[PDB]
Design a protein around this ligand. Structure first.
Ligand code: CA
Ligand code: CA
Ligand code: CA
Ligand code: CA
Lengths: 441, 441
């Protein structure tokens, strides 16, 4: 048959229309990992090799988790309820210096990926050590990934200095351009300078040039805390946004994480440079970083996305919960019950992330021609019934465990709630082994 | 055997110690619905008729959902993303006037109860029409309930005026004191005056007298919105807290819901009168009501509890998610990452609710002599591994679907994730029937 797979579902939320936000009794037709068409089930005349009848479920794009540190799944809830400073100095940094190597990153990324697939995520962004390990795990699992190879001014086990961080990013990009398993381009490598206060101007400019030459996305923290903004004003006499804008670092391919400290000048700079904002509400709350004013940013037409951050400051990788927090918090922050309606929250969590990571041409919404990165959510459960508008249900009363199926590039990674490329029992054993090693070395 | 049931579990979080917040390899012994003892498994010499081996699970008190409207499960996500005023006038109130009767409340409460049990809740507070229907559903399900019979100044189908609302509350209390199925006292009736701006001084004073004479708890909204506080200042020249204090309405048996508008005078009044505060973070965010400063309230030793509110402004009844929101939001609001640590969030969500509803003598913590209201949470799942401190995991990375077992008064209401006194498929059919009736009458 022309189509590999036909999926029938009562509801489809395409995110991009091709003027209601939802389609009733349509089907998706997929071929070679690509969406061929979305059409009414009754009218459809495209035969399919295989057909799946989902019934009372919602099909929508898989989530794009636009900021994370996948391998830190192995530090899940390592040290909760402590100030950023104690958390970092007495727990996270020693644990990183002692435990994080290629094996840690491999097993941690596998664990994260399995959690993410089970909660409907089809693309993750990763900013962490040993990105080749992370990228390789993504390849074996079949999940789409953007690994923002870290760049820092300071030495770690992974690299001694900015130039070495950059070298390894270039090497990793080259390795994935040429990897036998990566012909489909599921894994992209980018540059992940941590933050303006940990990376100097020179490496940042190198990143800009290299990012352009090698077609790589860039991610950086921006205005995460009042402290970082004050520090920048003391040291550079500029807000970080201004510093980055003045050296030409900010542009469309850059995503700026957090942005809890926002003034009108920041917004103008963001509008000018075309950069995206990645919202991480739960992590911002948990660490007391502040309140990203996504309502205000949205009204200013700033591109917005959503990330969970890492499992040591969340502590899960559940985009259903993160998107719900984003939609609820925004109404409180803006004092406006109509701010960030459900369709907008879903859009941030899918197409917004795709745009932020530079991959919206291929994924992030259900449009003919885009990749078949799809999640199916089963609504026939007590906590989801009755349903009046499935779009708002997705955001306000859906558990991630309702995800029944997941496809990436048209490949089934989750079938009736069960992982198809990862072994849950094995991953859990490895997690427990690492916990013991971390707990009592 | 002396004990009816022995439950073995790797972790027990008793909430009240009898100085670590958790017990390793202990067991719970239950007899006649009562906790006989909590002892090390190895040392235990109390035989039991039946023994359950749970392994890597946490036993803790079932949640006390201290404010809700159970039957509004049938309005789940009725009209999302609208301002309080449109929400009420164009959606909720017409739907209530048209659909809410004894049959609505029966089937809605059953649906809510099933959702709540599946997410580990063992006591719910309800403030809604036809409390006898709600109470009767609680009795048949086996869940503990406090039904705060509504009192209002204005006419509804349920009652024409304050005196009639009060009459029906008295009748309902009497009916449950004498109900053949209620000998164990699972169901308590209370008074639920909606808010200072919908109930006059006279009925409020009657409630105080009757509450005392009949040993009934009282629940009221207090300082939910800036509008209500301003309105009270115009009309009475007092903050609502002051109005209620001056007529002697506030006392230990009263729970005050929301409290997003707080000044130092409010706190003093609350400290003086001994009343409890019920925190409903997601509903407050969703409707843009404001930010209850639970960190500040906690530091002032004000008794605190947690509620989900109703399914039209949440939109689920999941106390795992609500407690996590409470713990996270509080750090952001107070700008203090150490504020409302996990053990304190759990305590609010269990013992805090018990105290608020006047039932802490019998439930809310795992102490010898208290009721066996218990939930078991399975940690052997991908998203919960690894685990370093189960207490903080409960709050920061646990899904409600991890609840494997639930007991109320030592009766199993949920066995391996399956309801034992309610039929899930039936409830869902009824929910869909009501949705159709509500959607297209
Ligand atoms: Ca981060
Ligand atoms: Ca989370
Ligand atoms: Ca309410
Ligand atoms: Ca909720």
């Amino acid at each position: 048959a022309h189509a590999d797979l036909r999926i029938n579902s009562h509801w489809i939320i395409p995110i991009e229309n091709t003027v209601s936000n939802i389609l009733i009794d349509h089907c998706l037709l997929i071929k070679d990992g690509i969406i061929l068409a979305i059409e009414p089930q009754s009218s459809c005349q495209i035969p399919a090799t295989e057909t799946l009848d989902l019934g009372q479920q919602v099909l929508m794009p898989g989530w794009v988790n636009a900021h994370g540190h996948a391998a830190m799944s192995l530090f899940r809830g390592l040290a909760d309820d402590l100030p950023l400073m104690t958390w970092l100095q007495e727990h996270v940094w020693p644990a990183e210096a002692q435990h994080v190597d290629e094996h840690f990153v491999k097993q941690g990324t596998e664990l994260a990926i399995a959690e993410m697939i089970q909660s409907g995520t089809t693309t993750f962004a990763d900013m962490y050590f040993y990105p080749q390990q992370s990228g390789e795990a993504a390849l074996a699992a079949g999940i789409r990934a953007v690994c923002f190879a870290p760049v820092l001014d300071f030495p770690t086990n992974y690299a001694q200095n900015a130039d070495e961080y950059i070298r390894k990013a270039i090497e990793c990009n080259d390795r994935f351009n040429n990897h036998p398993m990566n012909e489909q381009g599921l894994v992209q490598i980018g540059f992940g300078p941590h933050a303006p206060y940990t990376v100097s101007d020179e490496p940042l400019k190198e990143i800009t040039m290299l990012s352009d030459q090698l077609d790589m996305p860039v991610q950086i923290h921006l205005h995460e805390t009042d402290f970082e903004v004050s520090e920048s004003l003391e040291t550079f006499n500029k807000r970080p946004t201004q510093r980055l804008a003045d050296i030409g670092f900010l542009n469309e391919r850059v995503s700026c994480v957090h942005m809890t400290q926002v003034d009108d000048g920041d917004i103008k700079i963001l509008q000018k440079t075309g950069a995206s904002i990645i919202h991480c509400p739960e992590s911002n709350l948990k660490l007391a970083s502040g309140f990203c004013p996504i309502a205000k940013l949205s009204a200013a037409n700033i591109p917005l996305a959503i990330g969970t951050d890492g499992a040591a400051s969340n502590n899960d990788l559940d985009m259903f919960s993160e998107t719900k927090t984003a939609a609820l918090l925004a109404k409180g922050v803006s004092q406006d019950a109509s701010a960030i309606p459900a369709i907008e929250a879903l859009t941030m969590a899918t197409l917004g992330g795709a745009r932020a990571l530079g991959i919206d041409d291929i994924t992030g919404s259900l449009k003919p021609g885009k990749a078949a990165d799809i999640q199916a959510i089963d609504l026939n459960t007590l906590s989801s019934q009755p349903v009046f508008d499935p779009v708002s249900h997705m955001v306000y009363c859906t558990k991630s465990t309702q995800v029944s199926h997941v496809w990436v590039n048209g490949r089934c990674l989750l079938k009736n709630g069960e992982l198809t490329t990862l072994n849950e029992e094995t991953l859990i054993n490895h997690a427990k082994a690492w916990a013991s090693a971390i707990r009592t070395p």
